[PDB]
Amino acid sequence: GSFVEMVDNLRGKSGQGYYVEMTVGSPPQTLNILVDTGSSNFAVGAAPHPFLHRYYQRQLSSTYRDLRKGVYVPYTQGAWAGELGTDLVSIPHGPNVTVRANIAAITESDKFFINGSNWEGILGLAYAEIARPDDSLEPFFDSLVKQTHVPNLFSLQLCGAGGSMIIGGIDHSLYTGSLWYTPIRREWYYEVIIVRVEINGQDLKMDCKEYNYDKSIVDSGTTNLRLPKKVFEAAVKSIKAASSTEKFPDGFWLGEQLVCWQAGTTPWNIFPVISLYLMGEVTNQSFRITILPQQYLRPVSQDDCYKFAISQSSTGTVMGAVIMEGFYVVFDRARKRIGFAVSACHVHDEFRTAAVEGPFVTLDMEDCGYN
Ligand SMILES: C[C@@H](NC(=O)c1cc(COC(=O)[C@](C)(N)Cc2ccccc2)cc(N(C)S(C)(=O)=O)c1)c1ccc(F)cc1
Numbered sequence: 543g544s545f546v547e548m549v550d551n552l553r554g555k556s557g558q559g560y561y562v563e564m565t566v567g568s569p570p571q572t573l574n575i576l577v578d579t580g581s582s583n584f585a586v587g588a589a590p591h592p593f594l595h596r597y598y599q600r601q602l603s604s605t606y607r608d609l610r611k612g613v614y615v616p617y618t619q620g621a622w623a624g625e626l627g628t629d630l631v632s633i634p635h636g637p638n639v640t641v642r643a644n645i646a647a648i649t650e651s652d653k654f655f656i657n658g659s660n661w662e663g664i665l666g667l668a669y670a671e672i673a674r675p676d677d678s679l680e681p682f683f684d685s686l687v688k689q690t691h692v693p694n695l696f697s698l699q700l701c702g703a704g705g706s707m708i709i710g711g712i713d714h715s716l717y718t719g720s721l722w723y724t725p726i727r728r729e730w731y732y733e734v735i736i737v738r739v740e741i742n743g744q745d746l747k748m749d750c751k752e753y754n755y756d757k758s759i760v761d762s763g764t765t766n767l768r769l770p771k772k773v774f775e776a777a778v779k780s781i782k783a784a785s786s787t788e789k790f791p792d793g794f795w796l797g798e799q800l801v802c803w804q805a806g807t808t809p810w811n812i813f814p815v816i817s818l819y820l821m822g823e824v825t826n827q828s829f830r831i832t833i834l835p836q837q838y839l840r841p842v843s844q845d846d847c848y849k850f851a852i853s854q855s856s857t858g859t860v861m862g863a864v865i866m867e868g869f870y871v872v873f874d875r876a877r878k879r880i881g882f883a884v885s886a887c888h889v890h891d892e893f894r895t896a897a898v899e900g901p902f903v904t905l906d907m908e909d910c911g912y913n
Contacts, residue, residue, distance in 0.1 A: 545713040551635035552577065553704035557840060558659035560700050560762065560863075562636065562707055566645065567603030567629045576664040577698065577707055579732050579873065580761030580860070582673040583615055584631075584682040585624060586663030588647030593655040594662050598647055605630045613646050615674045618764070618857065620654035622646075631682070636709045639690040643682045664763070667696070667873070671730035683875070694876040698762060701887035702867035703841050717870035717883035722829040722898050724820035726878045727911060731759040734880060736859060737828050737907045738819035739773070741780040748776055750910035756858030757912060760871070760880060764862030766797075767816075767838060768855035777816075777852065784814035794850055802847040810835050810891055816852075818865075821907045822900065823879065828907065829900025831882050833868045836889040837896065840864070858912075868896035 543549075553574070554560040561574040566586065573586055573596060587597040600606045609626040624646040632640040648654075648663070655662075670677040670684060680688075687694045692710040699706040699716045706716055727733040736753040739746040755770045769777060778795045788809070793799035803809075813835035819828045839848040851864045868888045872881035888896045 543713045543715055545708050545711055548636055548708050549706045549713060549715065550704065552700070552707055553660070554700070555704060556658060556660070557703060558656045559661050560705055561661040562665070563634055564663070564665065565632045565634055566598060567600075568605040569602070571598060571603065572634070573598065573663050574661045576661045576763055577667070578664050578761070578763035579667045579698075580759060580763045581617065581664065581666035582668040582670060582681040583613070583646055583664070583666040583679070584643055585615070585622065585646035585648050587655065588624060589649045591651065591655055593657045593659070595660070596662055598645075598663070600627065600647055603629055611675075613674055615646070617654070620652060622648045622651040622654050624648040624650070626679070633709070636707065637686070637690070637692045639686070639692060641685050641689045643685045644679055668731055669729045695872070695874050697870060697872040698866065699870045699885055699887060700762065700863055700866045701885070702837070702863070702889050705887065712872060716886050718886060719884050719898060721872060721881040721883040722900055723823050723874070723879040723881045724829075725823065726880060729878070731757065731761075732873065732880060734758050734760060734861070735821040735907065735910050736818050737821055737904050737910050738830070739777065740817040740830075741777065742784045742814035743817075744780065744784070746773075746776050746780060748773060750907075751912070753859060754910055754912055758859035758861065760861045760866070762863065762866055764860045765840070765864070766851045766853045766860070766862050767864040768853050768860035768862065770858060771854050771856065773859070774852070774854040781814055781816075785812055787812045797850055797853050800842055800847045800849050802845040805844050805846055808846055808848070811893060813839070815894060819902065819904065820882075821910070824901075826903055826905055826907070827900070828902045828904040829898065830902065831865070831869060832897040832899070833865065834890055834894055834896055836891070837868045838864050869898065
């Protein structure tokens with residue numbers, strides 16, 4: 543394939559975030575940067591921190607331009623403060639371009655950086671609406687598309703227990719079967735609409751408005767599949783019922799307790815598959831993505847310890863790495879849609895595999911979204 547030099551450009555594996563190398567300033571300073579579709583700021587550690595191996599030294603960059611303005615970014619998890627500026631930025635294993643991008647130099651942070659994660663900054667790939675301080679701070683990908691001829695599209699293959707970020711296109715070696723597209727409802731987060739949920743083929747039978755209450759977003763920088771409280775509770779009762787060939791403590795289903803098995807003995811087969819039906823591109827048409835326990839049970843000697851990685855949220859549905867590790871995911875910004883196909887690297891067994899299937903007939907899907 544023609545995008546071959548972008549294949550395998552992501553690292554992670556320790557399970558603490560997927561990062562790409564980005565080269566900033568002049569002379570070059572290369573740092574490991576978290577690939578984050580749940581936010582819209584490009585920011586790098588710019589001062590020593592106990593969890594950082596390296597950081598951005600602005601004094602050493604001749605092309606750095608201080609915007610003389612501060613920035614504070616609080617996330618769902620963690621927060622940071624820094625200084626705004628612009629500098630030259632390239633991705634040595636991404637597109638063959640260099641852009642002048644907004645960069646936040648992080649000087650202070652709380653519960654943001656992760657010990658042993660090996661990433662030192664974050665690349666917010668969502669839209670300007672959710673950028674801080676405000677939507678006038680052009681996100682990196684917006685700069686890329688305005689300044690170059692790189693097509694307005696990227697795609698992500700996250701390989702769980704690195705992966706690929708293809709910028710400007712799609713690489714067919716990264717997936718099997720067909721790509722299925724769901725509309726981006728609104729360009730702020732990567733917002734989508736979930737129309738039905740099944741556990742082992744059994745409908746959860748909740749009003750679809752509950753699935754997207756507040757919103758449903760795709761976020762490569764969130765570990766879990768996060769579900770609204772009412773949805774989470776129903777899903778857990780259903781998953782418990784379907785996996786009742788063995789029992790687990792209450793706190794396991796809450797993420798508070800881990801269960802471990804002897805190496806290579808995890809009874810994947812006793813846990814159900816989970817299907818999310820997403821709005822399709824044609825009227826009354828949907829498709830479904832199906833994940834295995836290998837996706838939603840995340841590994842933490844001779845002992846294989848796992849955390850249940852479906853959790854509750856009060857800010858709507860978040861399709862994090864639990865979802866993304868099953869699939870090659872196409873963020874087709876030019877056509878305002880997100881595609882899913884079975885990943886060439888998703889973790890599975892000889893009996894079951896992740897799936898993307900359709901089409902299905904689903905009526906009144908427009909009703910499912912929150913206003
Ligand atoms: C970086 C790291 N991400 C996390 O640990 C993580 C991140 C968020 C909020 O995440 C967010 O608010 C942002 C938009 N992704 C920004 C961000 C905040 C902090 C760290 C990195 C990026 C929430 C949660 N949960 C509350 S949870 C346990 O329900 O998933 C877990 C990660 C990402 C992907 C992976 F495969 C593995 C680790």
